[PDB]
């Protein structure tokens, strides 16, 4: 297998959380400066970032200074997910994490992305 996701908490120069979905045979990724929305109605900024390799999904440890992405990476949540809808401008999924669960939607507009919870 079932596709998985991870939310990594990344203590870099700007603290943020990275949401990564196993999708298109890579980790499709978004940085969340204020984290995953944990209740209905809350609309969080999501910043599309570069694809990562599948093997990175379980990573924890320190990205060294001088490298792009420096800082400590921890797993904040993880689990399987079920894809419900997908186009170039919308991704709707059921998350099966311990913190991130139920349905969520990523949307793309002319200003970037947003992440919301059902
Ligand atoms: Co990051």
JSON list of N, CA, C and O in Angstrom, two decimals, residues 6-12 16-20 52 56-65 68-77:
[
{"chain": "A", "resi": 6, "resn": "UNK", "atom": "N", "xyz": [5.00, 10.20, 4.52]},
{"chain": "A", "resi": 6, "resn": "UNK", "atom": "CA", "xyz": [5.66, 10.61, 5.75]},
{"chain": "A", "resi": 6, "resn": "UNK", "atom": "C", "xyz": [5.49, 12.12, 5.94]},
{"chain": "A", "resi": 6, "resn": "UNK", "atom": "O", "xyz": [5.40, 12.87, 4.97]},
{"chain": "A", "resi": 7, "resn": "UNK", "atom": "N", "xyz": [5.39, 12.55, 7.20]},
{"chain": "A", "resi": 7, "resn": "UNK", "atom": "CA", "xyz": [5.58, 13.95, 7.53]},
{"chain": "A", "resi": 7, "resn": "UNK", "atom": "C", "xyz": [6.85, 14.03, 8.37]},
{"chain": "A", "resi": 7, "resn": "UNK", "atom": "O", "xyz": [6.92, 13.46, 9.45]},
{"chain": "A", "resi": 8, "resn": "UNK", "atom": "N", "xyz": [7.85, 14.73, 7.85]},
{"chain": "A", "resi": 8, "resn": "UNK", "atom": "CA", "xyz": [9.11, 14.88, 8.58]},
{"chain": "A", "resi": 8, "resn": "UNK", "atom": "C", "xyz": [9.09, 16.26, 9.21]},
{"chain": "A", "resi": 8, "resn": "UNK", "atom": "O", "xyz": [8.68, 17.23, 8.59]},
{"chain": "A", "resi": 9, "resn": "UNK", "atom": "N", "xyz": [9.56, 16.34, 10.45]},
{"chain": "A", "resi": 9, "resn": "UNK", "atom": "CA", "xyz": [9.78, 17.64, 11.07]},
{"chain": "A", "resi": 9, "resn": "UNK", "atom": "C", "xyz": [11.25, 17.98, 10.88]},
{"chain": "A", "resi": 9, "resn": "UNK", "atom": "O", "xyz": [12.14, 17.21, 11.23]},
{"chain": "A", "resi": 10, "resn": "UNK", "atom": "N", "xyz": [11.49, 19.15, 10.30]},
{"chain": "A", "resi": 10, "resn": "UNK", "atom": "CA", "xyz": [12.80, 19.55, 9.80]},
{"chain": "A", "resi": 10, "resn": "UNK", "atom": "C", "xyz": [13.26, 20.83, 10.50]},
{"chain": "A", "resi": 10, "resn": "UNK", "atom": "O", "xyz": [12.76, 21.91, 10.21]},
{"chain": "A", "resi": 11, "resn": "UNK", "atom": "N", "xyz": [14.20, 20.68, 11.43]},
{"chain": "A", "resi": 11, "resn": "UNK", "atom": "CA", "xyz": [14.77, 21.81, 12.16]},
{"chain": "A", "resi": 11, "resn": "UNK", "atom": "C", "xyz": [15.91, 22.44, 11.38]},
{"chain": "A", "resi": 11, "resn": "UNK", "atom": "O", "xyz": [17.08, 22.19, 11.66]},
{"chain": "A", "resi": 12, "resn": "UNK", "atom": "N", "xyz": [15.53, 23.26, 10.41]},
{"chain": "A", "resi": 12, "resn": "UNK", "atom": "CA", "xyz": [16.44, 24.01, 9.56]},
{"chain": "A", "resi": 12, "resn": "UNK", "atom": "C", "xyz": [16.38, 25.49, 9.93]},
{"chain": "A", "resi": 12, "resn": "UNK", "atom": "O", "xyz": [15.76, 25.87, 10.92]},
{"chain": "A", "resi": 16, "resn": "UNK", "atom": "N", "xyz": [10.11, 23.76, 9.73]},
{"chain": "A", "resi": 16, "resn": "UNK", "atom": "CA", "xyz": [8.95, 23.43, 8.91]},
{"chain": "A", "resi": 16, "resn": "UNK", "atom": "C", "xyz": [8.76, 21.91, 8.95]},
{"chain": "A", "resi": 16, "resn": "UNK", "atom": "O", "xyz": [9.58, 21.16, 9.52]},
{"chain": "A", "resi": 17, "resn": "UNK", "atom": "N", "xyz": [7.69, 21.47, 8.31]},
{"chain": "A", "resi": 17, "resn": "UNK", "atom": "CA", "xyz": [7.34, 20.08, 8.20]},
{"chain": "A", "resi": 17, "resn": "UNK", "atom": "C", "xyz": [7.22, 19.71, 6.73]},
{"chain": "A", "resi": 17, "resn": "UNK", "atom": "O", "xyz": [6.58, 20.42, 5.96]},
{"chain": "A", "resi": 18, "resn": "UNK", "atom": "N", "xyz": [7.83, 18.60, 6.34]},
{"chain": "A", "resi": 18, "resn": "UNK", "atom": "CA", "xyz": [7.78, 18.19, 4.95]},
{"chain": "A", "resi": 18, "resn": "UNK", "atom": "C", "xyz": [6.82, 17.01, 4.80]},
{"chain": "A", "resi": 18, "resn": "UNK", "atom": "O", "xyz": [7.03, 15.96, 5.41]},
{"chain": "A", "resi": 19, "resn": "UNK", "atom": "N", "xyz": [5.79, 17.20, 3.99]},
{"chain": "A", "resi": 19, "resn": "UNK", "atom": "CA", "xyz": [4.86, 16.12, 3.65]},
{"chain": "A", "resi": 19, "resn": "UNK", "atom": "C", "xyz": [5.34, 15.47, 2.37]},
{"chain": "A", "resi": 19, "resn": "UNK", "atom": "O", "xyz": [5.57, 16.15, 1.38]},
{"chain": "A", "resi": 20, "resn": "UNK", "atom": "N", "xyz": [5.52, 14.15, 2.42]},
{"chain": "A", "resi": 20, "resn": "UNK", "atom": "CA", "xyz": [6.00, 13.42, 1.24]},
{"chain": "A", "resi": 20, "resn": "UNK", "atom": "C", "xyz": [5.10, 12.23, 0.96]},
{"chain": "A", "resi": 20, "resn": "UNK", "atom": "O", "xyz": [4.84, 11.42, 1.86]},
{"chain": "A", "resi": 52, "resn": "UNK", "atom": "N", "xyz": [11.78, 13.60, -4.05]},
{"chain": "A", "resi": 52, "resn": "UNK", "atom": "CA", "xyz": [12.83, 12.89, -3.34]},
{"chain": "A", "resi": 52, "resn": "UNK", "atom": "C", "xyz": [12.74, 11.42, -3.69]},
{"chain": "A", "resi": 52, "resn": "UNK", "atom": "O", "xyz": [11.72, 10.96, -4.20]},
{"chain": "A", "resi": 56, "resn": "UNK", "atom": "N", "xyz": [14.08, 7.64, 0.89]},
{"chain": "A", "resi": 56, "resn": "UNK", "atom": "CA", "xyz": [14.17, 8.69, 1.89]},
{"chain": "A", "resi": 56, "resn": "UNK", "atom": "C", "xyz": [12.99, 8.71, 2.84]},
{"chain": "A", "resi": 56, "resn": "UNK", "atom": "O", "xyz": [13.00, 9.43, 3.86]},
{"chain": "A", "resi": 57, "resn": "UNK", "atom": "N", "xyz": [11.99, 7.87, 2.57]},
{"chain": "A", "resi": 57, "resn": "UNK", "atom": "CA", "xyz": [10.75, 7.98, 3.33]},
{"chain": "A", "resi": 57, "resn": "UNK", "atom": "C", "xyz": [10.93, 7.67, 4.82]},
{"chain": "A", "resi": 57, "resn": "UNK", "atom": "O", "xyz": [10.20, 8.21, 5.66]},
{"chain": "A", "resi": 58, "resn": "UNK", "atom": "N", "xyz": [11.90, 6.81, 5.13]},
{"chain": "A", "resi": 58, "resn": "UNK", "atom": "CA", "xyz": [12.17, 6.38, 6.50]},
{"chain": "A", "resi": 58, "resn": "UNK", "atom": "C", "xyz": [13.33, 7.17, 7.14]},
{"chain": "A", "resi": 58, "resn": "UNK", "atom": "O", "xyz": [13.71, 6.90, 8.28]},
{"chain": "A", "resi": 59, "resn": "UNK", "atom": "N", "xyz": [13.89, 8.15, 6.43]},
{"chain": "A", "resi": 59, "resn": "UNK", "atom": "CA", "xyz": [15.07, 8.85, 6.92]},
{"chain": "A", "resi": 59, "resn": "UNK", "atom": "C", "xyz": [14.83, 9.63, 8.21]},
{"chain": "A", "resi": 59, "resn": "UNK", "atom": "O", "xyz": [13.80, 10.30, 8.36]},
{"chain": "A", "resi": 60, "resn": "UNK", "atom": "N", "xyz": [15.78, 9.53, 9.13]},
{"chain": "A", "resi": 60, "resn": "UNK", "atom": "CA", "xyz": [15.95, 10.46, 10.23]},
{"chain": "A", "resi": 60, "resn": "UNK", "atom": "C", "xyz": [17.44, 10.68, 10.43]},
{"chain": "A", "resi": 60, "resn": "UNK", "atom": "O", "xyz": [18.26, 9.76, 10.22]},
{"chain": "A", "resi": 61, "resn": "UNK", "atom": "N", "xyz": [17.79, 11.88, 10.82]},
{"chain": "A", "resi": 61, "resn": "UNK", "atom": "CA", "xyz": [19.17, 12.22, 11.12]},
{"chain": "A", "resi": 61, "resn": "UNK", "atom": "C", "xyz": [19.47, 13.64, 10.71]},
{"chain": "A", "resi": 61, "resn": "UNK", "atom": "O", "xyz": [18.58, 14.42, 10.35]},
{"chain": "A", "resi": 62, "resn": "UNK", "atom": "N", "xyz": [20.75, 13.99, 10.77]},
{"chain": "A", "resi": 62, "resn": "UNK", "atom": "CA", "xyz": [21.16, 15.36, 10.53]},
{"chain": "A", "resi": 62, "resn": "UNK", "atom": "C", "xyz": [21.68, 15.59, 9.11]},
{"chain": "A", "resi": 62, "resn": "UNK", "atom": "O", "xyz": [22.67, 14.98, 8.70]},
{"chain": "A", "resi": 63, "resn": "UNK", "atom": "N", "xyz": [21.02, 16.46, 8.36]},
{"chain": "A", "resi": 63, "resn": "UNK", "atom": "CA", "xyz": [21.56, 16.93, 7.09]},
{"chain": "A", "resi": 63, "resn": "UNK", "atom": "C", "xyz": [22.63, 17.98, 7.40]},
{"chain": "A", "resi": 63, "resn": "UNK", "atom": "O", "xyz": [22.36, 18.97, 8.08]},
{"chain": "A", "resi": 64, "resn": "UNK", "atom": "N", "xyz": [23.86, 17.78, 6.92]},
{"chain": "A", "resi": 64, "resn": "UNK", "atom": "CA", "xyz": [24.93, 18.68, 7.35]},
{"chain": "A", "resi": 64, "resn": "UNK", "atom": "C", "xyz": [24.84, 20.10, 6.80]},
{"chain": "A", "resi": 64, "resn": "UNK", "atom": "O", "xyz": [24.22, 20.35, 5.77]},
{"chain": "A", "resi": 65, "resn": "UNK", "atom": "N", "xyz": [25.50, 21.02, 7.50]},
{"chain": "A", "resi": 65, "resn": "UNK", "atom": "CA", "xyz": [25.53, 22.42, 7.11]},
{"chain": "A", "resi": 65, "resn": "UNK", "atom": "C", "xyz": [26.25, 22.60, 5.79]},
{"chain": "A", "resi": 65, "resn": "UNK", "atom": "O", "xyz": [27.15, 21.83, 5.45]},
{"chain": "A", "resi": 68, "resn": "UNK", "atom": "N", "xyz": [22.05, 21.82, 0.86]},
{"chain": "A", "resi": 68, "resn": "UNK", "atom": "CA", "xyz": [20.70, 22.34, 0.71]},
{"chain": "A", "resi": 68, "resn": "UNK", "atom": "C", "xyz": [19.75, 21.43, 1.46]},
{"chain": "A", "resi": 68, "resn": "UNK", "atom": "O", "xyz": [19.51, 20.29, 1.06]},
{"chain": "A", "resi": 69, "resn": "UNK", "atom": "N", "xyz": [19.21, 21.96, 2.57]},
{"chain": "A", "resi": 69, "resn": "UNK", "atom": "CA", "xyz": [18.32, 21.23, 3.45]},
{"chain": "A", "resi": 69, "resn": "UNK", "atom": "C", "xyz": [18.93, 20.92, 4.82]},
{"chain": "A", "resi": 69, "resn": "UNK", "atom": "O", "xyz": [18.46, 20.01, 5.50]},
{"chain": "A", "resi": 70, "resn": "UNK", "atom": "N", "xyz": [19.98, 21.65, 5.19]},
{"chain": "A", "resi": 70, "resn": "UNK", "atom": "CA", "xyz": [20.67, 21.39, 6.45]},
{"chain": "A", "resi": 70, "resn": "UNK", "atom": "C", "xyz": [19.71, 21.34, 7.63]},
{"chain": "A", "resi": 70, "resn": "UNK", "atom": "O", "xyz": [18.68, 22.04, 7.64]},
{"chain": "A", "resi": 71, "resn": "UNK", "atom": "N", "xyz": [20.04, 20.53, 8.63]},
{"chain": "A", "resi": 71, "resn": "UNK", "atom": "CA", "xyz": [19.32, 20.50, 9.89]},
{"chain": "A", "resi": 71, "resn": "UNK", "atom": "C", "xyz": [18.83, 19.11, 10.25]},
{"chain": "A", "resi": 71, "resn": "UNK", "atom": "O", "xyz": [19.01, 18.17, 9.48]},
{"chain": "A", "resi": 72, "resn": "UNK", "atom": "N", "xyz": [18.20, 18.98, 11.41]},
{"chain": "A", "resi": 72, "resn": "UNK", "atom": "CA", "xyz": [17.75, 17.69, 11.90]},
{"chain": "A", "resi": 72, "resn": "UNK", "atom": "C", "xyz": [16.41, 17.30, 11.33]},
{"chain": "A", "resi": 72, "resn": "UNK", "atom": "O", "xyz": [15.47, 18.11, 11.33]},
{"chain": "A", "resi": 73, "resn": "UNK", "atom": "N", "xyz": [16.33, 16.07, 10.83]},
{"chain": "A", "resi": 73, "resn": "UNK", "atom": "CA", "xyz": [15.07, 15.53, 10.31]},
{"chain": "A", "resi": 73, "resn": "UNK", "atom": "C", "xyz": [14.58, 14.42, 11.22]},
{"chain": "A", "resi": 73, "resn": "UNK", "atom": "O", "xyz": [15.33, 13.49, 11.53]},
{"chain": "A", "resi": 74, "resn": "UNK", "atom": "N", "xyz": [13.33, 14.54, 11.66]},
{"chain": "A", "resi": 74, "resn": "UNK", "atom": "CA", "xyz": [12.66, 13.53, 12.45]},
{"chain": "A", "resi": 74, "resn": "UNK", "atom": "C", "xyz": [11.36, 13.15, 11.76]},
{"chain": "A", "resi": 74, "resn": "UNK", "atom": "O", "xyz": [10.79, 13.93, 10.99]},
{"chain": "A", "resi": 75, "resn": "UNK", "atom": "N", "xyz": [10.88, 11.95, 12.04]},
{"chain": "A", "resi": 75, "resn": "UNK", "atom": "CA", "xyz": [9.55, 11.55, 11.58]},
{"chain": "A", "resi": 75, "resn": "UNK", "atom": "C", "xyz": [8.50, 12.03, 12.56]},
{"chain": "A", "resi": 75, "resn": "UNK", "atom": "O", "xyz": [8.47, 11.62, 13.71]},
{"chain": "A", "resi": 76, "resn": "UNK", "atom": "N", "xyz": [7.61, 12.90, 12.08]},
{"chain": "A", "resi": 76, "resn": "UNK", "atom": "CA", "xyz": [6.53, 13.44, 12.90]},
{"chain": "A", "resi": 76, "resn": "UNK", "atom": "C", "xyz": [5.29, 12.53, 12.81]},
{"chain": "A", "resi": 76, "resn": "UNK", "atom": "O", "xyz": [4.58, 12.35, 13.79]},
{"chain": "A", "resi": 77, "resn": "UNK", "atom": "N", "xyz": [5.02, 11.99, 11.62]},
{"chain": "A", "resi": 77, "resn": "UNK", "atom": "CA", "xyz": [3.95, 10.99, 11.45]},
{"chain": "A", "resi": 77, "resn": "UNK", "atom": "C", "xyz": [4.23, 10.24, 10.16]},
{"chain": "A", "resi": 77, "resn": "UNK", "atom": "O", "xyz": [5.04, 10.69, 9.33]}
]
